[PDB]
């Protein structure tokens, strides 16, 4: 019956690539996460296991236990993987952020990128190569990478990534790209246009979409603005909405459908209590692992638009 269709099965029926979720071994081996992900979602992103602190706690000495679990679980369950994330300022060991030499940090950054993407070469649909690189005002965020390498670190990260695995779609990912009139949204479009004009292989813009209630409507204009940068893809990468209103969620799903370059949507987790903001109950399954009204609203709208 119609009532029984998945959001992933339906978004695929409408011409999209996936409707996925952020997860990791800890979730996958508890509660009903794995069963829900197998049945309802086509794509997974490692919540933590592929970040720098997790994978390179000391220079050159990599740890892949968690990441390998996620990648193999995904492969044996037919789920696409978005690798996440290579270069960014949170989850960065202080051994990295300590480096003050340009050529040392450059080499360190390139080794980190190449190591990770070489290990999973060919198995990763898309990588968030650079995360959270813009300030709110639209200027580039003054991280250790920006301050020590300079703004060339972004082109360098993407060229390096393309060399390590030319099969993966290479993304830049950010939050607060949800309003078309917001400086951050306009800036990332402008910079990504310029970088791509100079042959930087930015295949995608990822918009995390951590929404407050009522912010769904504006995504309808923010998302096509993001796609006007001319990347082959855009994605919604960490979707969750404080209060989980059906309107907010359906607006975001509709923005995706409206944007030919939008390949899919990944929500920030499965069940509310596992949210970074659990008390705003922002996800699509509740504390009993039951689908919420927003989940039904999405399925229904996906069918109705067919």
Swiss-Prot record:
A Pfam family of this chain: Glyco_hydro_10
Keyword Transmembrane carried by entry: no
Any one biological process term the GO annotation gives: xylan catabolic process
Disulfide bonds: 256-262
GO MF entry, a single one: endo-1,4-beta-xylanase activity
Stored Gene3D superfamilies: Glycosidases
UniProt family annotation: Belongs to the glycosyl hydrolase 10 (cellulase F) family.
Protein name (database record): Endo-1,4-beta-xylanase
Organism this protein belongs to: Thermoascus aurantiacus
Originating gene: XYNA
